[PDB]
Structure 1
Amino acid sequence: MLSPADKTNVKAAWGKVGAHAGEYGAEAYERMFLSFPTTKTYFPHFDLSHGSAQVKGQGKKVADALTNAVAHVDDMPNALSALSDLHAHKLRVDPVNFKLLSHCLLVTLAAHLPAEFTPAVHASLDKFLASVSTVLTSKYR
């Protein structure tokens, strides 16, 4: 469960991300594809080279969904409903990969938020991405 301090921590840190959210989402995917090459099995239809428009676009859509989730942190199942449908029924990404992207989003935030990524904020961000991941895989079966 996300405590009230976690929600405060996540809003502060994601608020700092601000306009760079989309860029950081793209970098998290790039990091995941390089560090965990099996995740590329879900994007054989994309140009995965560095800088690709398709990866930037994926990054921006994922970041906007995270912004939405942070804005609706007390009702994430509802806010992410369409995306939980999409992942469960069409994309069908193995649940294991959500932890890989989450780790790469944490590494990207760490690399871009020197001031904000304290131990407490790291823990809250980790819990938040695990919560988001749980919502996104909740309808898989």
Structure 2
Amino acid sequence: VLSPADKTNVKAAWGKVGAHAGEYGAEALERMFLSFPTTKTYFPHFDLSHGSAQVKGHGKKVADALTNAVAHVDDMPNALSALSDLHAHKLRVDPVNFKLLSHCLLVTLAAHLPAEFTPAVHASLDKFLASVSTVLTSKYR
């Protein structure tokens, strides 16, 4: 469960992301695809080449959803209902993959927000991505 310190830590870190959230979304996708090629199985219809507009667009979409999640950190289940649905009944992404994307997002944040990626903030963002993962896979069965 996210403690008040966690929530603050997350709000802070994400605050610094700002107008780059989209780029970081796209970058995390690219690192996932290259590091865990099994993840690519879910995107047969995309051009997964570097700098692909499909990848960029999707990166934005994910980034945007994360933002809305930070903003409703106290009410995630509710803020992500629609998304929980899409994932459990339409996309049906295996749950192990949420852990891969979460890891690539940390790696991306670390590389871009050195001053802000402290041990305490690292711990909070990790818990955070884990909660978001839990919410997104809660209606699977």
Which band: TM-score by shorter chain?
A: over 0.9
Q: How far off is 1:45 after superposition?
A: 0.5
CA drift of 1:20 comes to 0.2
SS in 1 for 2:59: helix
For 1:94, what is the secondary structure of its paired residue?
A: coil
Structure-2 separation of matches of 1:23 and 1:80? 22
Once the 2 structures are TM-superposed, how far is the Cα of residue 131 of structure 1 from its aligned partner?
Answer: 0.3
Question: 1:29, CA displacement in angstroms?
Answer: 0.4
| CA deviation after TM superposition for structure 1 residue 84, in Å | 0.3
Q: Deviations over 1:61-106 (max 9, x none)?
A: 0000000000000000000000000000000000000000000000
Root-mean-square deviation (Å):
0.3
Instruction: State the alpha-carbon separation in 2 of the partners of residues 10 and 27 from structure 1.
Output: 19
Cα distance in 1 for partners of 2:61, 2:15 equals 17
SS at match of 1:73: coil
What does the per-residue CA deviation read over 1:95-132, in whole Å, with 9 as the maximum and x for residues that have no partner?
Answer: 00000000000000000001000000000000000000
Give distance in 2, aligned partners of 1:56 and 1:140: 27
In the alignment, which residue of structure 2 is the partner of 1:25?
25
C-alpha displacement at 1:6, in angstroms?
A: 0.3
TM value normalised by structure 1: 1.00
Deviation at 1:133, TM superposition (A): 0.4
Q: How far is the alpha carbon of 1:30 from its aligned partner?
A: 0.2
Deviations 1:7-36 (A, max 9, x none): 000000000000000100000000000000
Q: CA deviation at 1:2?
A: 0.5
TM-score normalised by structure 2 residue count: 1.00
Q: Partners in 2 of 1:22 and 1:133 — Cα distance?
A: 19
Indicate whether 1:125 and 2:125 are aligned: yes
Q: Quick one: distance in 1 between partners of 2:86 and 2:15?
A: 27
Q: Which runs of 5+ in 1 are unaligned?
A: none
Paired residue for 2:10? Answer: 10
Q: Cα offset for 1:135? A: 0.2
User: Distance in 1 between the 2:28 and 2:70 partners?
Assistant: 18
**SS of equivalent to 2:139:** coil
SS at the partner of 2:74? helix
Equivalenced residues, count = 141
Superposition deviation, residue 58 in structure 1:
0.7
